[PDB]
Symmetry: D2
Subunit: 233 residues, 4 copies
């Protein structure tokens, strides 16, 4: 059953890892894709074409207002709408606090947190006109774990949750849901549990597709931990 | 048919949420075994009318003897249980100064012992076959300020503790254990309860989504957790309440 | 003497955490009434040697009769209870496949019924006087993946649910209800338990503070919650575990 | 009993509301104060003098690296140390999402989140040398509540918690604790519960003094809700 048929889904950071897996899972579900990423998405486009869906890929720095505004327009001209926004772009370099500079700290927020805002500002207007929308933000289980050298990272991942919860309250009456997913230590090309096994991008796709469907229209402001039963909240 | 060729047990499945979940599981290709104090004529028909098989048993899920008898009747009728939904539970309003040890204890027998007893009877089969699903119904009142429910809320919290611990115990057995926390849902019991007053307050006031919740709002989440798309999700509590609580 | 002229009841106060909390409350000017299965000779002496009065009773906090008798002995000796610390509780390791309904049930009687029974006996006096403190001991295992504890963790979660609900019921009565969640603490029982193995692992591995926890690490938090500096804090669970869990 | 005797406590936004109440409660406890705020702190200094403690007040925009670095130095020259840092500065203007501009969003982060970082970078070095420290961050119960027009605000309050948790992990081995306090709807000069009563600044002082003392040396990475029993987490 294609639960996302005729839906247009935007996925930042969709060129690799979790972003790609989600973009592809959505195409399988029947949705068209619009990818925003710093580097080309050859593998993604190809994968999405073979499914019979439309795909748009754009080299865009989601931390720059200009880029996002441009990307927003190019997406509306191309598909005329965005029903689903998946904020997946983010960086997680390990950096000891004594080495963490204000520049690195600010840089981590611009990419991990600002992007979600700028993208929301670009696509929420359309979602409201159509009276339907789905915003999914990627956070991290590290938010609840004891781990060093991630002061910058964990701070942005928590903002992601606050943003998910607060924006949920602002759009609840427009038929738009705002939720978040917190994966564990996933195995991507650049990357204690109840279920003994390393996590892979595919593990997150089921939750993403569920949240973006009608089966979760009454679920908003939540954070779903998909980590094999490590974190409990 | 994400649940084709599977057998699911649903306690308290005659009405409201339990019944709605039973019906949705059938639609997804699953046979049903309902355990309940009252008859489930409307549930059965709907399920049979969906082309699936159903078994309804008058059982007090709080009693070891009844659950055991129920377990046997299920095995010799369908064979083995793949999905267990612990939905049975009561929630009468009682002031702490009035709450007697007897009421306190009885609320635990129905709301907590039922889940344990039910898991003891069906986990062995799930384990021997390397696959299973256990879904526990809890309440958003766990994170809310509301009086006259120290007994109810203590059991709902236990439900969550039970969810988290059993998940750890069954993690290596292809079995996941999760919980669903609904808001104030519209059902025959609540409609005829003292909660009926909030039916118009809480929704368009403390919820992000200004709409009273109905059984069908929960079925999506249950179907999801009971499927392969959620095989790496265990020990979690999913609040389906229109955005009221945030945890 | 933040607790001068006050009477505090401490269940399971003969050893470990309970005893340490009893001793600290005395230092702050409070008299003590200990309820426990075993004798508390070391606790009494320490307390008497601090210039305060103490009462120790051999009582099974899980039994309604015993708690009632204990309640009366406390009233005719000290008068009225101002602070209640529900610290009694067991935590044997048991695999779910071995866990019998009898063990399950007995773990709830000792870990959960005790708190309820104890509150029933002392809340009335706290209410009539417009002031009181109820502190419940729970566990950080509530947020951790650990096997063979579905019974223990379900009761610990109930402890929290009990904390939250009673707080709502007693909010307007000058009484606050809170809980403390310790990490793996060093005590005679744990030292002679299967947990003794983690004594060197968990601390300098899963904790922010690389140090094994000892009873005195918890006393500060208890004294705080039992005082006026915490009169506007109720229904909360305070984890004192060196920064392991975050909730 | 003066549990903070001979301790030097820095309190951002200490000119009014919660900041002031905490600064004064700390002085009662025996600590010296160093206040950082946009406006003068006449009432505060006066209040702190009368207790017999030392006090330093400085007009400083805690969102500007330059100001914080200067403030940091002026504090070390004056007292030679900072044992306690209380990140209390923050703004909470209600702003509907459709009206929220990228400028307002960025501005809210610079004041509510950046400040805590810059201040930590300035005083953690000293705390580590002395092998003792206490960092307390002010967050908000709104983080767990359904309320509109606070997407910017709630997002920063959540980052405050992530920062509290992550920094706790980085400094745990240096004898430094990092905790947070989440008040309810407090009644300040510019500002559903189990305990029926409006909250006042004084309600938070007890928790702050507790956290900054030896009685909480084993408590780190936590968030304490002081709201009269509304929120449960
Ligand atoms: N990998 C993990 O173990 C893990 C754990 C927890 C949470 N997460 C979260 O998941 C997301 C990352 O997923 P991933 O692991 O698959 O990463 P990844 O390896 O796929 O890399 C991130 C992707 O985002 C892109 N990207 C980075 N900055 C960008 C920018 N400014 N503009 C546009 N695109 C940009 C990259 O080009 C890349 O395609 C982040 O939000 C991260 O916080 C990951
Ligand atoms: N309805 C709500 O708004 C709401 C909110 C939060 C949580 N819950 C939880 O959901 C569950 C109930 O949902 P509902 O209200 O839709 O159901 P419902 O209205 O159909 O009533 C509960 C059902 O449980 C059955 N039951 C009670 N005790 C039983 C026993 N000993 N043996 C077998 N069956 C028994 C009843 O016969 C009935 O069919 C409970 O676990 C409750 O704690 C409900
Ligand atoms: N020790 C830990 O590492 C740890 C961790 C998390 C939670 N806890 C909780 O803390 C409490 C115990 O702390 P502790 O280990 O320092 O205490 P402890 O080592 O002194 O042992 C428990 C005490 O409880 C008493 N007790 C048990 N059942 C009783 C009954 N029926 N009536 C009266 N007394 C009874 C025992 O006699 C004993 O004095 C329990 O509630 C437990 O769940 C302990
Ligand atoms: N007031 C509430 O109901 C409430 C509720 C939840 C959380 N909080 C939090 O508490 C803190 C505010 O406390 P308050 O209510 O007493 O506020 P307040 O009325 O005292 O005002 C904030 C103080 O911070 C100062 N300030 C603002 N920007 C500054 C800057 N850039 N540099 C230096 N100082 C600056 C102001 O001059 C003022 O003294 C914030 O962190 C806020 O998020 C407040």
């Amino acid at each position: 059953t294609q639960r996302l048929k005729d839906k247009l889904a935007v996925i930042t950071g969709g060129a690799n890892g979790i972003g790609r897996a989600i973009a592809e899972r959505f195409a399988v579900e029947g949705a068209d894709i619009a990818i925003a990423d710093l580097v080309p998405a050859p593998e993604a486009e190809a994968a999405i074409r073979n499914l019979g869906r439309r795909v748009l890929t754009v080299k865009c720095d989601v931390s720059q207002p200009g880029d996002v505004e441009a990307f927003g327009k190019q997406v509306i001209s191309t598909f005329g709408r965005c029903d689903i926004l998946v904020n997946n772009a983010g960086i997680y370099p390990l950096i000891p606090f004594d080495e963490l500079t204000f520049e690195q700290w600010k840089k981590t927020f611009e990419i991990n947190v600002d992007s979600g805002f700028l993208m929301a500002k670009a696509f929420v207007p359309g979602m409201k006109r159509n009276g339907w929308g789905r915003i999914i933000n990627l956070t991290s289980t590290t938010y609840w774990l004891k781990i060093e050298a991630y002061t910058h990272y964990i701070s942005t991942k928590a903002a992601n949750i606050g943003f998910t919860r607060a924006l949920a309250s602002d759009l609840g009456k427009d038929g738009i849901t705002v939720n978040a997913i917190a994966p564990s230590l996933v195995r991507t090309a650049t990357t204690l549990q109840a279920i003994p096994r390393l996590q892979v991008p595919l593990d997150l796709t089921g939750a993403a597709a569920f949240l973006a469907s009608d089966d979760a229209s009454f679920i908003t402001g939540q954070t779903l931990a998909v980590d094999g039963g490590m974190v409990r909240h």
